[PDB]
From a paper:
By sequential boot strapping, we optimized the oligonucleotide length, the position of a Br-dU, and the identity of the terminal nucleotide (rU, dU and rC) to achieve full views of U2AF651,2L bound to contiguous Py tracts at up to 1.5 Å resolution. The protein and oligonucleotide conformations are nearly identical among the four new U2AF651,2L structures. The extensions at the N terminus of RRM1 and C terminus of RRM2 adopt well-ordered α-helices. Both RRM1/RRM2 extensions and the inter-RRM linker of U2AF651,2L directly recognize the bound oligonucleotide. Surprisingly, the RRM2 extension/inter-RRM linker contribute new central nucleotide-binding sites near the RRM1/RRM2 junction and the RRM1 extension recognizes the 3′-terminal nucleotide. The N- and C-terminal extensions of the U2AF65 RRM1 and RRM2 directly contact the bound Py tract. Rather than interacting with a new 5′-terminal nucleotide as we had hypothesized, the C-terminal α-helix of RRM2 instead folds across one surface of rU3 in the third binding site. There, a salt bridge between the K340 side chain and nucleotide phosphate, as well as G338-base stacking and a hydrogen bond between the backbone amide of G338 and the rU3-O4, secure the RRM2 extension.
A tightly controlled assembly among U2AF65, the pre-mRNA, and partner proteins sequentially identifies the 3′ splice site and promotes association of the spliceosome, which ultimately accomplishes the task of splicing. Initially U2AF65 recognizes the Py-tract splice site signal. Biochemical characterizations of U2AF65 demonstrated that tandem RNA recognition motifs (RRM1 and RRM2) recognize the Py tract. To investigate the structural basis for cognate U2AF65 recognition of a contiguous Py tract, we determined four crystal structures of U2AF651,2L bound to Py-tract oligonucleotides.
Author numbering: 143 to 340
The structure:
C-alpha cells in the first residue's frame, strides 16, 4: 500500500537500450559493493522500464534499503547520471525519516538547489554525455551537484547544464576559465544561474 510506495524509487535519465536485467544487476552489485545493503543477498526485487520517457521504477525488498539507495542519486551508468527520486505518492512511514544516512564518495547529486554559487553552462555540444560534461567542469575541482538537461524526444542533451562546486571559492575561477571557451563549433556561456533564470 503505503508500504509498497516506501519500497519504490523513480530512476530517471536511464540510458537507451537498457534491459531490466542490466539495471537490476547494476543496482544490486553497486549497493552491495557500496555497503548500502543491510542484510545478505540482493536488495532489488523488481524493475519496470518505460523506454519512451527514459525512466524506471525500482522495487526493493525493504524500506530502509530503499532509503539508502537514494544516496546513489547521480551515480553514472553507461555515461548517464541517474536521477533517483521518491514516488510522487510516497508517504513516509511513522518513525522513519525520508532521506539517507549515508554518503557514497564520488557520487555527485543531480539536485542543484538555487544559490549564490550555482552555475549555468550553455553552448555545450549536445552529443556530450553527462559524464563527459562533468569531466569538463571538474577541471576546476570536484562537483557538489550537477544536472545536464536532456531533450525528451531525441534522447539527447539540450546543450545546457547546472552545477555547483564543492569549493565555494572556485566559482569565479570556473566562470573565468570556461566562459567563452571554444568547443568544436560553439563557444561556452558560463555564469551564475540567477542571471538568465526566467
Ligand atoms: Na526505518
Ligand atoms: Na532554448
Amino acid at each position: 500500500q503505503m508500504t509498497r510506495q516506501a519500497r519504490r524509487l523513480y530512476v530517471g535519465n536511464i540510458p537507451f537500450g537498457i534491459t531490466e536485467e542490466a539495471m537490476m544487476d547494476f543496482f544490486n552489485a553497486q549497493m552491495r559493493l557500496g555497503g548500502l545493503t543491510q542484510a545478505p543477498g540482493n536488495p532489488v526485487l523488481a524493475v519496470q522500464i518505460n523506454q519512451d520517457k527514459n525512466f524506471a521504477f525500482l522495487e526493493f525488498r525493504s524500506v530502509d534499503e530503499t532509503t539508502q539507495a537514494m544516496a546513489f542519486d547521480g551515480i553514472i551508468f553507461q555515461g548517464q547520471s541517474l536521477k533517483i527520486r521518491r514516488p510522487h505518492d510516497y508517504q513516509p512511514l511513522p518513525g522513519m525519516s525520508e532521506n539517507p544516512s549515508v554518503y557514497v564518495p564520488g557520487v555527485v547529486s543531480t539536485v542543484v538547489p538555487d544559490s549564490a554559487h550555482k552555475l549555468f553552462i550553455g553552448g555545450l555540444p549536445n552529443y556530450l554525455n553527462d559524464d563527459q560534461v562533468k569531466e569538463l567542469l571538474t577541471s576546476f575541482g570536484p562537483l557538489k551537484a550537477f544536472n545536464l538537461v536532456k531533450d525528451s524526444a531525441t534522447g539527447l542533451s539540450k546543450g545546457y547544464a547546472f552545477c555547483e562546486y564543492v569549493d565555494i571559492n572556485v566559482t569565479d575561477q570556473a566562470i573565468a576559465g570556461l566562459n567563452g571557451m571554444q568547443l568544436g563549433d560553439k563557444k561556452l556561456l558560463v555564469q551564475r544561474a540567477s542571471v538568465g533564470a526566467k
